[PDB]
Design an enzyme around this catalytic site. Structure first.
Site, mmCIF file in Angstrom:
data_model
loop_
_atom_site.group_PDB
_atom_site.id
_atom_site.type_symbol
_atom_site.label_atom_id
_atom_site.label_comp_id
_atom_site.label_asym_id
_atom_site.label_seq_id
_atom_site.Cartn_x
_atom_site.Cartn_y
_atom_site.Cartn_z
ATOM 1 N N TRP A 358 0.814 -1.330 -0.009
ATOM 2 C CA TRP A 358 0.225 0.017 -0.003
ATOM 3 C C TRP A 358 0.846 1.220 -0.032
ATOM 4 C CZ3 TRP A 358 -1.335 3.375 4.379
ATOM 5 C CH2 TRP A 358 -0.304 3.295 5.441
ATOM 6 N N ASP A 359 2.267 1.011 0.372
ATOM 7 C CA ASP A 359 2.929 2.208 0.533
ATOM 8 C C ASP A 359 2.849 2.931 -0.888
ATOM 9 O OD1 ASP A 359 3.946 0.269 2.174
ATOM 10 O OD2 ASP A 359 5.975 0.855 2.161
ATOM 11 N N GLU A 487 0.061 -0.377 13.007
ATOM 12 C CA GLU A 487 0.102 -2.016 13.204
ATOM 13 C C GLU A 487 0.476 -2.259 14.591
ATOM 14 O OE1 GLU A 487 1.614 -3.132 8.771
ATOM 15 O OE2 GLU A 487 3.123 -2.358 9.950
ATOM 16 N N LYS A 592 2.752 3.218 16.334
ATOM 17 C CA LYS A 592 4.164 3.004 15.011
ATOM 18 C C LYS A 592 4.019 4.131 13.963
ATOM 19 C CE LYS A 592 5.480 -0.603 11.878
ATOM 20 N NZ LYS A 592 5.398 -1.885 11.340
ATOM 21 N N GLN A 593 2.700 4.383 13.513
ATOM 22 C CA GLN A 593 2.830 5.557 12.589
ATOM 23 C C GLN A 593 1.694 6.138 12.417
ATOM 24 O OE1 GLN A 593 3.347 1.865 9.880
ATOM 25 N NE2 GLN A 593 2.210 3.112 8.255
#
Ligand code: K
Ligand code: K
Lengths: 754, 752
Positions: A358-359, A487, A592-593
């Site tokens: 998906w990046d 995640e 995480k992000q």
């Protein structure tokens, strides 16, 4: 964490060699031309800790799935790019003893990645007592001739006496993927040919029971040297070699060029035609001089820099950073092959397998839309459309209708093997759909979304419609059992970002279905009953929110955690992925992000400054940024909120993520998909670039630590140069028709030569 | 699926031999004496599909943990069961051709597991045209002499004309493990072969995980009327003896094979192990078959006296319950505090040798009711003795105190799934509860006030460090866990988990105020800790819904799309074999008792109204995809007077293996699963329970049963409860006068 290279504007160079930082060093000095790439491995060999990695674009293997425990729906294989037959091999012997920097003592070391010319230089003196030999290397993967790899070695005897030097240009198929699930080789040699002045190997990936494609590689070496050729026997059925020697007088020199042509079965239909091309291209290159080959290469790289360089004055650490990102990003992918995509670590490592994630549609799209022809991104959209068949299969593996694009893939079929990610990180479907919208808005080309794109949106919407459930208790639709972009939360309920993306997908698709022509609407065949169902989901989608904090709650129950800032975590316990047990990571309040912030970033103009402030101030301090894709979007959001110092700090964390080994994991390779970060931070962030109702808008600020920054952007057939100085921004129309842009609310007309 | 054995009261017997059911037959006819055990393999040899399985208690081998993606904290290795050196091998040759039921045709077949005497019988006639020879086998693994295996073979010529017979008793160390491909696990250290006996000393190969290697010593002695013949050693890994003879028509011969098995678990050195092997072999050679057998059967008879369950009107159930208790006792009878109850006991290898929270949760209640309290006491010390491994498990997750493992052989974790390994922590509470359960039943404070106090203290320390204080709710909570219902992963505030943590801390605080000075000093629990623990008990968050009047399994459970299990397509059940994990997780379907498991543990601490509301809500959402789920719910149903429902739920507990319900009994028996039937019968049907030191019953009779009678050991008394249509009757067979409660009435038992 650790910076092993000097700071320079156009070069990533060092004069230090330490066996302990070999893998990190190899990662930083990787090269690529889109067609293929490789880590900065020493061609002469090295017996110490190192990761041998050469990768051919689009050439992968279906590694049989490996898990502790099986779950129904798991994929049968984990596709991963194959570490290719080693064609750079070139051992060097001094008085019969081969050079090996893991054992040899050396002096005057230099490892230099020249980003402007796209060449890797390395030089040093082998110190063996009275025997001293200087070695100067230079190599590149031609952006002029995709199949071409060029290496040059110059030798000079620094001893007081004559010394024998022997170079053995060869090709070695005895390689392996360090991340192979069952410790097995992936290549079978089909044919080897060794002659006095040439050598070639034709290999093919071993068979598989998954019906996926097997790949054939053809590699042929040709040489140019003033050394004397020597007879040598083929060492193995998996390796071919040549030998050239010279007895060098004191201060005398010798040199050798190794031209390797690499062709694959994805460009030729048969072993015979593939083999023929291998020979013909080699004959062609043997007609060219080193200077000829190099200049054609450098000329193309110069052209690329001309169109997209980001000039930063007053801060070389930042200059080097942005240039390193764009250099490795383009070395990995420059849209030259419509069948390829962008592996998370490109051609610099094995982790993630170099597969499609998906990046691409979440972080790569913003950059390629800004600095490359719109046809590149349009093709990245079609890439997914062409894999709808696999998406239908992925959804069916989980008993769901519609299309479920995979977390990891090469042909459309899922490859990841963790239920929390494979089955539950479904926001990706939303990111895929958003990319369509993003491309359409930016380019003004709706020919895709009104056709192929309508089918992709329809099938994704069909998935959402089947994945939500109606909670009678709340009289709202919810999405239970998922994993958001963050995640570090697994199998949670009502991840805000996911519910938001699902609602948005349905909303946008309904809008598109009302715009397609009759023939298309007929094919799509979306009944009025479906549209009514989708509209109800849009109208009654549950979105977690907290009044007191005025924030969107990442997922239900998030606030019940023991909330505390990242600052409370002992430095020696970070990154937490390397120090904490998974259960601790999950229940902790650490992110995480971007998750809620990822959503806000995607729809940055749809939320008020106050809302954005509340969510940013709450979540950013809880974020550990343990995904290379985290820092950049946080920089933009910070800039958006006028947190200039924080934006610059975050810019550095992304622009120099690998260069300064911020996540303590660059030993596994470069974070290629993350190389998009610096550009986004500088353009969307510092420059405040936005596309609104068809027109470009900017509202730049200048990092207090900078003198200026200039970049070029592609927008609807116009090429614009934005230069930001202390006295304000400056725009110049380099090409295209007159264009009217918005600058901090003021409409400015751009015209060439005016 | 298919019932291959006849239905008999004390026997699992059949007169049909179909090679297709070979593995299933072997599993069902497994024997064991707590020290060692084995599948019903044919000692003469069999070349067809079969599972060779002989296992020694406490013996295991390590293997590298294997996962797709690594998580910090995962165990480095996991343990495996090891097929031992083949010491029952005894080929029989008729006219020079060995008997092999995979090739030979036979008639008058009998495979008989005698559960009352704990003996395996097998007989048949070898049909080879003009030659017909009867063979009668009998063997047992002595509960009188644990190291002893005794086999007997009788040969009778039934054809016209004389026949030649040769038996070659031997010990073969060239064995393999099926579940693996990793060739050999045993290295032969010493072999000895005489015309009179034979022996083999072997030791498991070296491992890189620092775990124990095991040495076994096996010696065979014979007793026969056949004539000994000189035979050379087959090879390096096998020793043998040979006996032959000619049988005239209708003549017969017999041979006994006594094997002594010793292990390094009981001997400090190889030569001391070897010395014992010889010593015991000499001792046994002084006894006759009858004396060895009588000593064995006498002990089994005593075991049945204290546990037998007689059912009339349901022969299928009569055999099933007996089979459950027989294989349970054969697996473990508290003889060695270092051993436990693996899921497959000594009947197979696939995931069958480790210890699970299952023994504390389900095996415990059964052993407490039908064996001397010394047995369950040993099951408790088992955990106390593995406290060190529990500290390591906790430390692997950065937590204080003790975290007992999900799967273990030595106390250290073996499981490799983060959602289970790291998160299914209710097991700590289950282990603490077992201590209480034992204390309340036996009335013996000695354990809980000593070793038990230490176990409780460290488990409490784990809880105190695992909870977190939610300022938002001003309550302590436990996020990111997996309850007994493994169909919910990484959830928050699982009611049963929070309830068990609070209970553990509360009970431990009670105990601490009662331990003696030496213990108190050893436990070294500060007043600071005690104050903290009390605060946790006082402010522990417990999920509850006022409108439904139920304890909520975990936070947000009611937001799921609640729908009854009846809505699941019958063909898609069990769902773990049909659905993708994500669907299973988000669904409202429950694998086994979770909230109901906690209610079951504290069945008398909740009102009938609370139990009804919770049972009525959750049972219809439970798919019962756990062997014990039906048994536990059967008890709760009976407790609520849902007689038909209790009986329906019970019907699936007893014959899981005998009728091969999961189509996998071929891999071995489900020992830990065999505790369900007794639980449902005694705690459920009979309504048995211990309340403030007093024994209580309130039985009802299943509609299709004419009566049921069971034995129960309580406070040094042996009681027999007989339930008939006219009501219950009691008999005090042993012990001092005791007053019990029968449906509210106090009944005095005497004439013991
Ligand atoms: K977390
Ligand atoms: K569930």
């Amino acid at each position: 964490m650790k910076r092993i290279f000097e700071v320079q504007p156009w070069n990533v160079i060092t004069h230090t060699f330490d066996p302990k930082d070999k893998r990190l060093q190899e990662s930083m000095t990787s090269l690529g031309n889109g067609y293929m790439g490789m880590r900065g491995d020493f061609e002469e060999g090295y017996s110490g800790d190192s990761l041998q990695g050469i990768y051919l674009g689009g050439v992968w293997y279906p590694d049989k799935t490996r898990v502790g425990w099986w779950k129904n729906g798991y994929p049968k294989y984990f596709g991963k790019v194959v570490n290719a037959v080693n064609f750079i091999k070139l051992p060097i012997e001094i008085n019969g003893e081969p050079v090996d920097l893991a054992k040899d003592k050396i002096s005057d070391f230099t490892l230099d990645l020249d980003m402007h010319q796209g060449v890797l230089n390395r030089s040093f003196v082998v110190e063996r007592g009275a025997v001293r030999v200087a070695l100067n290397f230079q190599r590149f993967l031609s952006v002029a001739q995709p199949e071409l790899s060029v290496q040059k070695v110059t030798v000079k005897n620094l001893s007081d006496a004559e010394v024998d030097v022997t170079l053995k240009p060869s090709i070695d198929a005895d390689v392996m993927n360090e991340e192979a699930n069952y410790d097995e080789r992936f290549w079978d040699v089909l044919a080897t040919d060794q002659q006095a002045d040439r050598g070639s190997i034709v290999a093919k990936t071993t068979p598989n029971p998954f019906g996926t494609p097997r790949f054939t590689s053809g590699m042929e070496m040709r040489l140019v040297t003033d050394l004397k050729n020597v007879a040598i026997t083929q060492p193995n059925e998996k390796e071919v070699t040549t030998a050239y020697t010279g007895k060098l007088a004191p201060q005398a020199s010798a040199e050798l060029e190794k031209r390797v042509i690499v062709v694959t079965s994805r460009d030729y239909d048969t072993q015979e035609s593939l083999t023929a091309a291998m020979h013909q291209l080699s004959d062609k290159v043997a007609q060219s001089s080193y200077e000829d080959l190099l200049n054609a290469h450098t000329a193309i790289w110069a052209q690329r820099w001309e169109k997209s360089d980001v000039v930063i004055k007053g801060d070389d650490e930042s200059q080097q950073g942005i240039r390193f990102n764009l250099f490795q990003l383009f070395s990995t992918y420059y849209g030259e092959d419509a069948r390829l995509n962008i592996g998370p670590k490109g051609f610099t490592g094995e982790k993630y397998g170099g597969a499609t994630y998906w990046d691409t549609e979440a972080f790569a799209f913003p950059v390629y839309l800004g600095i490359t022809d719109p046809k590149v991104t349009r093709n990245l959209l079609m890439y997914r459309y062409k894999q709808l068949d696999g998406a239908y299969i992925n959804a069916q593996e989980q008993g769901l209708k519609g299309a479920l694009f995979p977390m990891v893939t090469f042909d459309g079929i899922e490859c990841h093997n963790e239920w929390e990610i494979t089955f539950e990180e479904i926001h990706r479907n939303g990111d895929i759909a958003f990319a369509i919208y993003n491309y359409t808005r930016y380019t003004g080309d709706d020919s895709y979304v009104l056709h192929e794109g309508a089918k992709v949106l329809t099938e994704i919407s069909r998935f959402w419609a089947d994945r939500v459930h109606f909670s009678k208790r709340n009289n709202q639709y919810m999405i239970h059992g998922v994993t958001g972009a963050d995640e570090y939360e697994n199998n949670v309920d009502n991840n805000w970002d996911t519910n938001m993306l699902a609602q948005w997908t349905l909303k946008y698709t309904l809008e598109i279905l009302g715009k397609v022509d009759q023939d298309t609407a007929k094919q799509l065949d979306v009944s009025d009953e479906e549209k009514t169902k989708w509209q109800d989901i849009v109208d009654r989608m549950y979105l977690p929110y907290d009044k007191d904090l005025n924030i969107f709650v990442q997922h239900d129950g998030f606030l019940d955690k023991d909330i505390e800032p990242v600052s409370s975590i002992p430095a020696d316990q970070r990154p937490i992925n390397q120090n904490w047990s998974w259960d601790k990571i999950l229940r902790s309040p650490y992110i995480k992000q971007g998750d809620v912030l990822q959503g806000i970033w995607d729809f940055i103009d749809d939320y008020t400054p106050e809302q954005k402030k509340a969510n940013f101030d709450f979540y950013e301090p809880l974020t550990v940024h343990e995904s290379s894709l985290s820092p950049a979007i946080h920089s933009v959001l910070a800039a958006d909120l006028h947190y200039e110092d924080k934006a610059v700090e975050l810019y550095s964390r992304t622009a120099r993520l690998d260069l300064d080994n911020y996540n303590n994991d660059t030993t596994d390779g470069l974070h290629i998909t993350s190389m998009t970060g610096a550009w986004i931070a500088v353009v969307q962030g510092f420059a405040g670039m936005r596309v609104r109702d068809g027109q470009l808008h900017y509202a730049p600020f200048l990092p207090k630590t900078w003198t200026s920054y200039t970049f070029r952007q592609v927008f609807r057939d116009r090429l614009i140069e934005v230069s930001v100085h202390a006295d304000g921004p400056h725009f110049k129309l380099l090409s295209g028709e007159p264009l009217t842009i918005d600058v901090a609310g003021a409409a400015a007309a751009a015209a060439a030569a005016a």
